Structures are given as C-alpha cells and as structure tokens.
C-alpha cells in the first residue's frame, strides 16, 4: 500500500520517499474505532496503437485469473463483442449488404449500423458465461485512451486474484495491480462525523487546505486528514515516511545506497470515548426522540447530548441527531460544539455566581418572587408564580427556576435595584460586561477548548442601552450556547469550581508494530482553564439548589431525576423560540452524579418542542444514561 510521492534530484543524487501506514484510533478501553484496510485494484493502460484483437487477447488471459461483475455491459457492448465472437455468423447475416459495401453503394458506417440492427433475437444468446467475463474486462479496457490507466476491478479484488495477476504482468501487456489503504470503521456509522476523513489519494491535499499543508513540508500527492479528528491529530497519526538516498553517475548506475529513514507507522491515538457508552447513549437518544414525538413533539428537529467526566474533562460520549418532520434521523454529533442555541433557565447557576462575585447578592439572600412592573406597564414574571408573591432563597430560586430572582440580581448588578414602576437602566454596558464575565468563568460564552476544529463560542450581541436584552441574558434568553458549553459549565459546578478543557483525545502511543499499541508516548490532558472567582460557600449554594431542583417535589427536574440509581443534581431550561411563525421551545438539561463525588456530568438540548402546558420529560434521557452508567 506504499506509494512513493517524492523523487528529489541533486548531485546526480536521488532521494525517494515511501509512504507509511496511518495510526489507529482507539476508545478508552483499547477497542479499535478507526483502522486501516488494504484495497487492491486491477488496472489497464491503453497505448497509442494497441489493437482491438490484442485487448481481447489480454482480457481473455485475465478471465483465467479473476472473476468479474457482468453489470455495466451495455447492449452496444454485447453486439460489438458478438461480431468477433463468431465472424462467419456476422458474415452470414450481411450477405447482401457486404456486396453493396464492395460495390461502393453503401458506406462502412451504413453497413455497421445495419449489422448491429440485425440481431438481438435467439442469436445474441450465443454469449457463453466466459464471453461475458472477457467482455466485462474488454469494456473497461476501452474507456478513454492515452496512457491514463482505466480500472478493471476495484471492489471485491481478492488476494488470490491480486497474486495471480501480479505474477503474470509480464504476460499481460498494459495490465497492472495496485495496493492501497483505506480507513476501516469497525463500529459502522457511530461517531464518523467526529472521526473525520482522510483525503482519497486521487485527491491529495484538498484545495481548501493546501498551502497550510505545503508550509509544513508535505506534497500535493500526500493523503492527509481532511476534517475533525483526522485533521486535528494529523501529525501524530501520520507516519514518518521511508526515505532512501541514491548516488549515481554517468548514465545512472547506483554506486551507493543510503537509508536516510527506514520509516515508521503513525502513532495510535486513544480517545476518552467509551464506545459502549456511546452506543448506549445513541440508542437511548433515538428511543427518547421517538417517545417525545409520540407525545406531540413532531417539529423537534435537533436532539443533542454530551457526557463527560467532570473531574478531568474526558468526553465519554457525544451524540446528536437532526430530525425531520417524519422523525427520520441524520447523525449530527458535531453539533454539540459547532451549533449554538437559546438554552434558557439552565444558565441560572452561572447568573448567581456572577451576582455573588460582584457583591450584588449574598449567599442565602431571600427576595420576593412576584410580577415585576416597569415604566409604561411592561411586566416580567416567573413561570411558576405568574400571579402570587413568594419569598425565596437563591437555592429555592434554582429549584423553582425563578426568573424574578435573577432579574432582581441583574438589576442590583446594574446598580439600580428594582422598585415598582421604575424605568429600566438606560446604559447597562458595564453591568452586561460583568454578567458576561461571570458566565464566561463557568464556560458560558467562551470556547470550551475542545481538541477539535470549528468550535463556536455562541452568538454574543452588543450590550449597551438594551436593558431588556440584559435581563434576558440573566435567564438564558439572549446569548446562545453550545451543548458542550452547558456540559463544561455543569462540570465546573460538579467539580467545585474548576473549569476544565473538554477533550476527546486521551493518549498517544509510540506505535511501531502492526496491530499493537506499543508503549504510551504522551497523555492528552484536560487543562484547568480557571477556577471560578467564588468562595466555597457560593459554589456549594449553587450545588445545593441544583440538588433541590432534581430531588425536591417542587424542583423542575423531580419527575425525571428523583429516583436515579445514585443521587443526581442539575438544572433545567425551557426557552421560547419560533419556527415559521409558530411558538416552540428549546428544552435543556444539565446534571451530574453522584452528588457527593461526581464522576459523570451531561448536557442535553432539544430544539423546537411544543410550548408546554403539557410538560414533556426529555430529561428522562439523562436519568436513563445515569442509571445505565451506575448500573453496577
Ligand atoms: B427558563 O428557561 O426555564 C424555566 C423552566 C425550566 O427550568 O425548564 C421557566 C422560566 C424560564 N423560561 C421562560 O420564562 C419562558 C418559558 C417557555 C415555556 C414555559 S416558560
């Protein structure tokens, strides 16, 4: 499978480079996710004046060494072929016409057309099974001449056939055999969008990526990582090419051979993914989509989940689906970090941390949740309390998913505490920057740092004199976020305030031998990006409100998470959106388990569900993943 790629001249002095096999990709338990697999091809090269009877002779020899698919053979192909495969039938068919041809009263053109008009009946069935074999090869030998090689067979080329033909090339003029490698995916479709692609050799480095690869010393012939993991880890996964140096003279006779580099296969790359958890998450996700649809959510068009270990940033599973109006799924795993959404009230843990650290509120502070009234009659209120007046804690605000507690926190942060009928503060630029700065510290609004390309930080619009948008930022209805940000954020809460870089790469192996990992070269770490600027009592208050959300009867997540096999904690969000002018919501869930020493965290995003008066319980997906992961 080793193509050349380079032949570098100098002092009558040639240097040739031979390609090497690409590293494998393994899950966290060593299971092979991305392998190499050999592909063989039989090719033909058509010369200046290589006759038709010669191509028929080479092809007949090939039928002894290979077996062919007899599709592709058009009826034109068979009719022509039939002419040689018995001339004195064709001659018996055109007694009269051959005499006119010789008289010069018809042309060869007219004669040919009329002959191929003259059979299809019982005497085209004269083609024996081996005839169709020779013709299946003949038809590919004529495809468009000049020394451009046409392929005779690509799929299903066996090793018996490759060998029999390779050792016969001196008797098979124009014929050739090639050995090439392609990526093999033992687990099928799972995670193919995250793995990415390598260029198809006929491609070489794609134009979009050219120059960037040439600036590293590669060639336009080289096969390279095109996207996502293959691209991200391209230079650990690529081998070191075998490089020979030759010194010739006069006419070219080599007098000294040099082995600059023997060559080595690429390093194996081990991921944080647990492929069995990944398959289980994917299966629960499809069951949850289908269950949500049968409950009315037939416009829901995305469903995404990230699963991490919050202590080290490891991405244990990452899955997404796009859903059409009939509930057919398309794989959309990369949407967890390339797509951004309005996530709603699940951000409110971050809002409180931002309030504490600017001393806008104190841990444990109570405020009255009630409809707020502003100048001119504009109102704002909490969903759970549209008409009443309730005194609540910061952690009860999280349990209930209070809007008004966060509005009041935002107004205190803007140096303008709520009073009934007030006009909203005119300039909130400095408050907005402080609120975004607080949210940024848990992962809401910056790139999380995932070791994959094309991560977005979400949509971040100006905060100057739009106090309405500013209050909306405090409840999750302004800036947009990715599911991976939600997961980084809940992980920060779960691990006592350390914001960690998510990573799907876990380690790199110094791989030398075929199908053997080798010794460990390098660990891929989730670096601590920052600790939140908050005291331990502030972090624990948010933890406690998250636990009450999942475990108290009034918590928005009680119905889904109160009976998880280990105690779980988290936060829900429901945000109003619109599709073709119809009211919808996004539903979002973050959480972690066990409460006491969390080893699992997740986020879930569904888009364009119906607006609840009927509350769907899409968090059951998180319940189910928790119950599976802590089964034993
Ligand atoms: B918030 O995003 O989410 C809360 C409910 C939850 O945690 O799932 C309610 C208040 C906030 N959402 C809204 O104010 C807008 C709503 C859309 C559908 C019901 S409320």
Nearest residue to 592 (alpha-carbon basis) of 228, 205, 229, 310: 310
The rounded distance, in Å, linking the Cα atoms of 150 and 47 is 12
Q: Spell out the SS3 assignment of 529-551.
A: EEECCCCHHHHHHHHHHHHHHHH
What residues contact residue 214 under an 8 Å CB cut-off, 6+ apart?
205, 220
User: 574 C-alpha vs ligand 1 centroid, how far in Å?
Assistant: 4
Residues 356-360: contacts with CB within 8 Å, 24+ apart? 356/534, 356/535, 356/538, 357/438, 357/532, 357/533, 357/534, 357/538, 358/413, 358/434, 358/438, 360/409, 360/412, 360/413
Is the distance from CB of 417 to CB of 408 less than 8 angstroms? yes
What residues contact residue 436 under an 8 Å CB cut-off, 6+ apart?
445, 460, 463, 473, 479
Active site residue 170: no
In the block, tokens 């119906």 appear at 610
The rounded distance, in Å, linking the Cα atoms of 119 and 110 is 16
φ, ψ for residue 463 (rounded to 5)?
-120, 100
Is the distance from CB of 613 to CB of 316 less than 8 angstroms? no
Q: Which atom of ligand 1 has the smallest separation from the CA of 384?
A: 9
Which residues, judged by CB distance below 6 Å to any ligand atom, belong to the binding site of ligand 1?
Answer: 344-345, 383, 401, 403, 475-476, 556, 572-576, 585, 611-612
The rounded distance, in Å, linking the Cα atoms of 563 and 303 is 23
Selecting among 19, 199, 227, 345, the annotated active-site residue is 345
User: 166 C-alpha vs ligand 1 centroid, how far in Å?
Assistant: 69
| Residue-range domain boundaries for the chain | 1-31+186-271+505-524, 275-497+532-591+619-629
Q: Which mutation among 381, 401, 406 tests ligand 1's pocket best, with the greatest number of atoms within 8 A of CB?
A: 401
Angle at 148 (CA atoms; ends 144, 152), nearest 5 degrees: 75
User: 140 C-alpha vs ligand 1 centroid, how far in Å?
Assistant: 64
Nearest residue to 444 (alpha-carbon basis) of 473, 409, 414, 408: 473
The rounded distance, in Å, linking the Cα atoms of 362 and 534 is 11
Nearest CA to ligand 1 atom 1: 345
Is the distance from CB of 26 to CB of 33 less than 8 angstroms? yes
Q: Which atom of ligand 1 has the smallest separation from the CA of 549?
A: 7
φ, ψ for residue 378 (rounded to 5)?
-60, 130
Nearest CA to ligand 1 atom 14: 383
φ, ψ for residue 515 (rounded to 5)?
65, 25
In the block, tokens 């081990």 appear at 270
Nearest residue to 422 (alpha-carbon basis) of 377, 386, 391: 377
Q: How far apart, in Å, are the Cα atoms of 224 and each of 60, 202, 237, 239, 427?
A: 39, 12, 10, 11, 51
Nearest CA to ligand 1 atom 13: 575
- Please indicate the experimental technique that yielded this structure: X-ray
Ramachandran class of 252: left when φ > 0, alpha when ψ lies in -120 to 50, beta otherwise: left
Nearest CA to ligand 1 atom 11: 345
Nearest residue to 395 (alpha-carbon basis) of 358, 363, 347: 363
Domain 1-31+186-271+505-524 has CATH 3.90.1310.10: yes
Options 3.40.50.720, 3.40.47.10, 3.40.710.10, 2.30.29.30; CATH of 275-497+532-591+619-629: 3.40.710.10
């Amino acid at each position: 499978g080793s193509h050349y790629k380079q032949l570098i001249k100098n002092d009558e002095n040639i240097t040739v480079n031979e390609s090497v096999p690409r590293g494998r990709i393994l899950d966290r338990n060593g299971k092979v996710l991305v392998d190499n697999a050999s592909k063989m091809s039989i090719t033909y090269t058509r010369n200046r004046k290589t006759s038709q009877k010669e191509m028929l002779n080479t092809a007949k020899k090939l039928t002894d060494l290979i077996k062919m698919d007899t599709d592709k053979i058009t009826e034109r192909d068979k009719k022509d072929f039939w002419i040689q495969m018995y001339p004195s039938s064709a001659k018996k068919l055109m007694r009269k016409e051959q005499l006119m041809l010789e008289d010069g009263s018809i042309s060869q053109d007219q004669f040919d057309t009329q002959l191929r008009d003259k059979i299809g009946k019982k005497q085209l069935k004269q083609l024996t099974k081996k005839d169709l074999q020779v013709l299946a090869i003949y038809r590919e030998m004529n495809a468009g001449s000049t020394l451009d090689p046409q392929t005779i067979k690509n799929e299903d080329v066996s090793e018996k056939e490759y060998a029999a033909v390779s050792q016969q090339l001196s008797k098979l003029p124009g014929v050739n055999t090639t050995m090439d490698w392609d990526r093999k995916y033992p687990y099928g479709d799972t995670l193919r969008g995250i793995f990415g692609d390598v260029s198809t050799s006929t491609e070489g480095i794609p134009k979009e990526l050219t120059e960037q690869y040439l600036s590293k010393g590669y060639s336009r012939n080289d096969r390279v990582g095109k996207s996502y993991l293959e691209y991200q880890y391209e230079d650990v996964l690529k081998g070191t090419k075998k490089q020979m140096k030759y010194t010739t003279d006069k006419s070219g006779r080599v007098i000294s051979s040099e082995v600059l580099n023997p060559g080595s296969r690429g390093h194996d790359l081990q991921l944080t993914i647990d492929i069995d958890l990944q398959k289980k998450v994917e299966s629960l996700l499809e069951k949850q989509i289908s269950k949500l649809r049968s409950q009315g959510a037939k416009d829901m068009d995305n469903a995404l989940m990230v699963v991490q270990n919050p202590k080290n940033g490891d991405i244990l599973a990452i899955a997404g689906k796009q859903i059409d109006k009939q509930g057919k799924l398309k794989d959309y795993d990369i949407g967890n970090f390339t797509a951004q959404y309005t996530v709603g009230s699940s951000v409110k843990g971050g809002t409180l941390l931002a309030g504490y650290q600017n001393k806008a509120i104190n841990v444990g502070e109570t405020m009255v949740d009630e409809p707020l009234k502003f100048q001119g009659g504009l109102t704002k209120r909490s969903y759970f309390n549209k008409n009443g007046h309730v005194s609540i804690d910061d952690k009860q605000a999280l349990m209930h998913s209070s809007n008004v507690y966060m509005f009041k926190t935002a107004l205190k942060l803007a140096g303008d505490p709520y009073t009934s009928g007030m006009s909203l503060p005119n300039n909130i630029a400095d408050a907005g920057r402080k609120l975004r700065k607080g949210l940024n510290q848990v992962g809401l609004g910056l790139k999380t740092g995932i070791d994959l390309p094309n991560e977005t930080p979400g949509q971040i619009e100006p905060l100057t004199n739009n106090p309405g948008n500013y209050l909306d930022l405090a409840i999750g209805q302004y800036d947009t976020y990715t599911p991976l940000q939600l997961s980084q954020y809940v992980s920060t809460i779960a691990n006592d305030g350390y914001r960690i870089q998510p990573h799907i790469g876990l380690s790199i192996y110094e791989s030398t031998n075929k199908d053997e990992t080798g010794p460990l070269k390098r660990k891929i770490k989730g670096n601590v990006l920052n600790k939140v600027n908050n005291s331990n009592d502030e972090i624990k208050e948010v933890q406690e409100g998250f636990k009450m959300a999942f475990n108290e009867k009034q918590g928005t997540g009680y119905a889904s998470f109160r009976n998880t096999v280990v105690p779980s904690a988290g936060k829900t969000g429901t945000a109003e959106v619109f599709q073709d002018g119809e009211p919808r919501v996004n539903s979002t869930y973050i959480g972690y388990a066990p409460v006491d020493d969390p080893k699992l965290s997740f986020s879930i995003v569904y888009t364009n569900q119906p607006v609840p008066p009927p509350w769907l319980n899409g968090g059951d997906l998180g319940r189910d993943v928790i119950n599976y992961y802590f089964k034993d």
